Amino acid sequence: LVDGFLELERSSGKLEWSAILQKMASDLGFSKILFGLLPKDSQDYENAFIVGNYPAAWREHYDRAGYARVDPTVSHCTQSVLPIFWEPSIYQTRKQHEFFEEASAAGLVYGLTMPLHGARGELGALSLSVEAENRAEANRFMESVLPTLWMLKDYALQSGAGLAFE
Amino acid sequence: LVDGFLELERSSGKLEWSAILQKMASDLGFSKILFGLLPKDSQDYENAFIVGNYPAAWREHYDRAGYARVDPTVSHCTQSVLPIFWEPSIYQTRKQHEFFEEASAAGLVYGLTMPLHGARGELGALSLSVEAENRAEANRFMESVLPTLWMLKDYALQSGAGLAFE
Ligand SMILES: O=C(Oc1c(Br)cc(Br)cc1CNC(=O)c1ccccc1[N+](=O)[O-])c1ccccc1
Ligand SMILES: O=C(Oc1c(Br)cc(Br)cc1CNC(=O)c1ccccc1[N+](=O)[O-])c1ccccc1
């Protein structure tokens, strides 16, 4: 993990940094990731530093639909430092239901979001999806790697913030 | 850990919450802790919300000597979300050397500080010291529990920010 952080901090460019972070997620056993970060006092959710390998057409749709205002992981990130697991119970509103359905059609069904709060007031999220036969298998996988992930998100936040905002 | 968090969340008052957080640290192998938290925007280190079992007279001395402007873990917390271990190389200025020597006379020589950055802009530190026979042993210990500690500091922040400012 620390060697991963060192590779992140020796990377030259957004593309390289993204490739290293994706590989670190993938080595941990996740399949898709999205690292998103805004500068301090921005909720300008389109003009964020966004990196990872979610389907391009899903990312476009998420912006066009205004899903930053619906996605329950986003409001959760504004209120907590703790992870929020993509459980059926987090989708409550009708819009949140439609969100779940469309993300699911995008292959994003099981996973978690780690909120990111940087030392200069950066606000973000690291979301990671997992391929699994069922939610039970998914949840067990995520519990087995949660301590590594919890360290990873802070190493990603610290390196990423310097890359995004220099 | 999560049970520990749920206990913190069910607790009433600063006293019970302290006792729970101290026991969680002690169970993990650390003898002394300080959990320190400021509201958004404050740089008022002497009126920080403070919990733990550091010797009272060391806390008094820190306040009276203005060590918040000296203590190298404090500048680090303002810049980073990553832990900072109490290695001799972090003490660089003459005043920093005096601070190392005085902290050490208090029994606070081996340890680390986890920066705390909350979702409403709270700024803090969870410092934990370890009673070991020497620094080599303390560092072995701390490496072996680091991933638990890294999740712990965030649960403590999420619960304790409520306790401090809500
Ligand atoms: O990255 C952020 O949000 C974004 C941005 Br923007 C674009 C996109 Br696409 C996605 C997110 C975060 N949500 C998720 O990853 C997520 C969560 C639960 C179920 C399904 C999804 N999903 O998208 O498949 C973000 C940045 C700063 C602050 C808060 C959020
Ligand atoms: O609590 C904070 O700082 C405080 C406050 Br105030 C009072 C006191 Br006493 C201590 C700290 C934090 N330093 C340490 O724990 C520390 C670090 C390295 C070696 C020795 C010690 N030590 O003190 O024995 C704090 C709060 C917000 C942001 C940064 C720091």
What is the number of helices of chain A? 6
Distinct ligand kinds = the ligand O=C(Oc1c(Br)cc(Br)cc1CNC(=O)c1ccccc1[N+](=O)[O-])c1ccccc1
Question: Biggest sheet of chain A, strands in spatial order?
Answer: 2-1-5-4-3
CATH architecture of chain A: 2-Layer Sandwich
* First-last Cα distance of chain A: 24 Å
Largest sheet data of chain A: 5 strands, antiparallel
Number of domains of chain A: 1
Helix and strand run of chain A = HHEEHHEHEEH
Give descriptors for this structure.
Beta-Lactamase; sequence-specific DNA binding (chains A, B); binds the ligand O=C(Oc1c(Br)cc(Br)cc1CNC(=O)c1ccccc1[N+](=O)[O-])c1ccccc1; transcription regulation (chains A, B); five-stranded antiparallel sheet; homodimer; alpha+beta; 49% helix; 5 strands; DNA-binding transcription factor activity (chains A, B); transcription (chains A, B); 166 residues; globular; Transcriptional activator protein LasR (chains A, B)
Q: How would you summarize what this structure contains?
A:
The first copy, chain A, has helices at 2-9, 14-28, 56-64, 72-79, 94-105, 135-164; strands at 32-38, 49-52, 84-85, 110-117, 123-130. Chain A is of the alpha+beta class.
